[PDB]
Amino acid sequence: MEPKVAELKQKIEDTLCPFGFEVYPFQVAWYNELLPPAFHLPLPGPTMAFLVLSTPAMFDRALKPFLQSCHLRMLTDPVDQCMAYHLGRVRESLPELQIEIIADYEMHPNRRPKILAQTAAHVAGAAYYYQRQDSGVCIHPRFGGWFAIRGVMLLPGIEVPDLPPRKPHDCVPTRADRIALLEGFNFHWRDWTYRDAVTPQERYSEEQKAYFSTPPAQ
């Protein structure tokens, strides 16, 4: 890949990864090819995009700091504000270019562009999106179900038509475990054993578990 592309890629990861984030590059075309024009990313096929995932490490590295800093505001939501703070830091560190950013909290009805978080996770090779054919759940090769899709970043004009398509790891290969997953997700979602389909390195700590099991109310 062009030195420009390699540098900008590394700048993003040096900005996000030390804070419990992961970034996966992809071509817009891969996402659009299995989607009708209505749900397309309104950009040429070879346009570079980045899928952003948060890991279990992001709570302690990103959320607990910030929450104890002057950047914290009131009438929003602590977790959203943290996303908007770190994704802002990406903009700051790459001031030369145009970055269209859709954070997870902006993936809702009556807003464009319409992102399908789990489909993005699959095309970027970030996490395998297990469906009926194989409601679906997608599993991280390293963290199982203990992670979240946090945003997608679009970089207009920066095109990478020779970026190689990486398929997500089929980390739950057997037809048994797949059903043991989908039915443990569709019917017993409060039993987070399904997230251990692949047994993670880090798991959510007790304070993290408590925090996310809380219904958003201050």
Oligomer: monomer
Shape: globular
Estimated radius of gyration: 18 Å
| Structural class label | alpha+beta
Primary descriptors:
monomer; 218 residues; alpha+beta; four-stranded antiparallel beta sheet; two-stranded antiparallel sheet; 7 helices; 31% helix; globular
Compact overview of the structure:
With 218 residues, this protein is of the alpha+beta class. It has helices spanning 3-16, 28-32, 57-63, 78-93, 117-123, 175-186, 206-212; strands at residues 21-27, 47-54, 100-103, 128-130, 137-139, 148-159.
Describe this structure in words.
31% of the residues lie in helices and 17% in strands. The chain is α+β, with helices and mostly antiparallel strands and 218 residues long. It is built from 7 helices and 6 strands. The longest helix is centred in the middle third of the chain and has 16 residues, at 78-93. The termini are far apart. Helix 1 (3-16) runs antiparallel to helix 4. It has helices spanning 3-16, 28-32, 57-63, 78-93, 117-123, 175-186, 206-212; strands at 21-27, 47-54, 100-103, 128-130, 137-139, 148-159. A 4-stranded antiparallel beta sheet has the order 1-2-6-3, with helices on both faces. A two-stranded antiparallel sheet has the order 4-5. The chain is globular, with a radius of gyration of 18 Å. The chain has one domain. It is found in: Cytoplasm, Cytosol. Its EC number is 2.5.1.151, 1.16.1.6. Substrate binds at residues 104, 115-118, 129-131, 138, 149.
